Structure 1
Amino acid sequence: YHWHYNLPQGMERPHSVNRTFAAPFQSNHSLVNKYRGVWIEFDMHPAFSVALEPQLRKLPRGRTLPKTPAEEVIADYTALAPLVDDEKTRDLWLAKVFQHCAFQRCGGAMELWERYCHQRFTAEGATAKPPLSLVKSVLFYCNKTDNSGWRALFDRCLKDGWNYTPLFDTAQWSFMLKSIGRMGDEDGVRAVLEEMLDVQADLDRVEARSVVIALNAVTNADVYEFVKKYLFNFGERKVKFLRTTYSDLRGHGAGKLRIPLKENDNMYYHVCWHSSIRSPRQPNAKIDDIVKDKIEKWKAEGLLPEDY
């Protein structure tokens, strides 16, 4: 019951619980020092950076976003970029104005892709390979302005194409799924979510407001059954948070989004069913011959008479 005071007060047995169970760090709060954005990996040679320094000054650098309007940096790339004779310098410069026009939402920046980079990367079976910083910047741009040009570029990043999908970050897929749910591509949601499972991306650490938008745009019948088996891939902590965010984005907190959601209640009732499932509790030919033999018997018995 207790230990007496005249007994020797030795330790009875040691306990090694922290070395038998190695627990990873799990907090309900998010990380306060994370970038929460799409990184460009600006890796310019250190001779063009000081040469283009008045032009790169008005461009977004690491964790810095200048408020220069987008029509000036387009005009800087219109005139000065043919002067520099280097292929990867112009590609890294074009990735920055694609990032600058994304943060200011300028829809006219897709003309720069068709002017310079379309003919040598995405036209008529081009064998040249674009850098990773250019593909990340235009996919972040087309997802920000809800441009439909992401589909020709996302199909180029598969294993037979450029194979850049293992190099995409978890914040890249969050901005990707938000734009497809806003535009409403049912096969666009499935082709990305099949790619994220094939690439082994961090499915539990995608943005929860991005997943409930991409799941809200699921209306076709065959891709709706794809969502039912794909919803088991999330964690139990994630799938109970997808219910609370989807209920608030269609309820009181509908003003957090730029455009309102469309009412998809058959996805709403299934997510509320799937979140309650993961949470704890709190022969037609042979049968049709059977029935026809009985009606044949009942006319012989007289239970089904003729006209009187």
Structure 2
Amino acid sequence: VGYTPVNPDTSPMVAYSQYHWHYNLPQGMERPHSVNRTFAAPFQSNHSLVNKYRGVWIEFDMHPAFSVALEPQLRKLPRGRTLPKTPAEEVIADYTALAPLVDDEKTRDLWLAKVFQHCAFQRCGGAMELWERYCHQRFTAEGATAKPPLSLVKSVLFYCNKTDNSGWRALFDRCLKDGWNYTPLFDTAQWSFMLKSIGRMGDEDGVRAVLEEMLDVQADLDRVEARSVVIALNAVTNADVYEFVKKYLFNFGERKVKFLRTTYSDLRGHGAGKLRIPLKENDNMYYHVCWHSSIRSPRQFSPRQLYFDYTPSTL
């Protein structure tokens, strides 16, 4: 009785009533409850994971001989979680000079991959020359048999995305099932960077090819970084690719799709500053990603909105 309701735990007139347990009965537990055991939820935090590497790990496997031999050259290149500020010109000079002296293929290529990664972080454009000078001959040209070491490919790809470069499309294509079959070994961050670059450059077709492979190779869709999905989708103006992207959008999860919308509305919105290159206007893809989000969320009832104009009829 009142506008303030009784709280059923603290009130003995609830607790000890006939619909609950009186204090003179024997007070044991009624039934056991196993909730967590029967059907358990997987852990997904609202906050992203604080320790994760957040980059493209380039996997440095060197024989612990050349690793010691080449130390004064390698000390200038990135080691794990450490990014020395050495100017990229110098590093490339060192590779060009000293590398023909080393005899190992595997070593020369690990070293090269480090150089590429280093040049990806500084966004120096003259590093593809290195690909055409050493690797192109035995990997990409005229159906050469040789199969490049994975780390090298990851590194070059990462470089083509960081420095936006038409070249990526040629490399990526070699990684599908009939080629090197490297695509299932890519990191989630790899996909993230790829999508973002392709999106900036604006290839709907690059975007489609990449989303198809990602899906087939079972990438982690929900953990692909939202910004990069948005920038990729934003690039899609062509009727067919557009169709593809609706049908595809059904592959994300409820949550992912909600934040695809949030992120999208921010990047053309308040957070338009957050990007190094501003987005381009897609009103169509924006509207659609919002629409999709609305379709996939639970629906709420707002009767004064729906039935605002309802009039009954006696027909």
Structures share fold, TM-score greater than 0.5: yes
- Please give the per-residue CA displacement for 1:79-122, whole angstroms capped at 9, x wherever unaligned: 00000011000000000010000000001000000000000000
- Please give the per-residue CA displacement for 1:7-39, whole angstroms capped at 9, x wherever unaligned: 211111111111101211121100001001100
Distance 2:297 2:268 in 1: 22
TM-score normalised by structure 2 residue count: 0.89
Counterparts in 2 of 1:146 and 1:306: CA distance versus 1, 3 Å? closer
Which has the larger helix fraction? 1
Runs of 4+ aligned residues of structure 1 deviating over 4 Å after TM superposition are: 305-308
User: Based on CA coordinates, which of the two structures has the bigger radius of gyration?
Assistant: 1
Distance 1:218 1:5 in 2: 68
Partner SS for 2:99:
coil
- Please give the per-residue CA displacement for 1:197-235, whole angstroms capped at 9, x wherever unaligned: 110110000010000000000011110000010000000
Unpaired stretches in structure 2, ≥5 consecutive residues: 1-18, 301-311
> Over aligned residue pairs, what C-alpha RMSD do you find?
5.1
Partner SS for 1:233:
coil
Report the CA distance between 1:278 and its aligned residue. Answer: 0.5
Aligned to 2:133: 115
Report the CA distance between 1:3 and its aligned residue. Answer: 1.8
Counterparts in 2 of 1:154 and 1:11: CA distance versus 1, 3 Å? same
Partner SS for 1:30:
coil
Partner SS for 2:73:
helix
Report the CA distance between 1:4 and its aligned residue. Answer: 2.0
Counterparts in 2 of 1:12 and 1:72: CA distance versus 1, 3 Å? same
Report the CA distance between 1:5 and its aligned residue. Answer: 2.2
Aligned to 1:83: 101
Report the CA distance between 1:306 and its aligned residue. Answer: 44
Counterparts in 2 of 1:194 and 1:8: CA distance versus 1, 3 Å? same
Counterparts in 2 of 1:86 and 1:275: CA distance versus 1, 3 Å? same
Unpaired stretches in structure 1, ≥5 consecutive residues: 283-304
Distance 1:208 1:7 in 2: 57
Counterparts in 2 of 1:262 and 1:9: CA distance versus 1, 3 Å? same
Distance 2:314 2:201 in 1: 64
TM-score normalised by structure 1 residue count: 0.91
Report the CA distance between 1:6 and its aligned residue. Answer: 2.3
Report % sequence identity: 99
Report the CA distance between 1:307 and its aligned residue. Answer: 47
Aligned length in residues = 286
Write the mapping of 1:124-273 to structure 2, written as runs, cut at 5 A: 124-273=142-291
Distance 1:3 1:89 in 2: 76
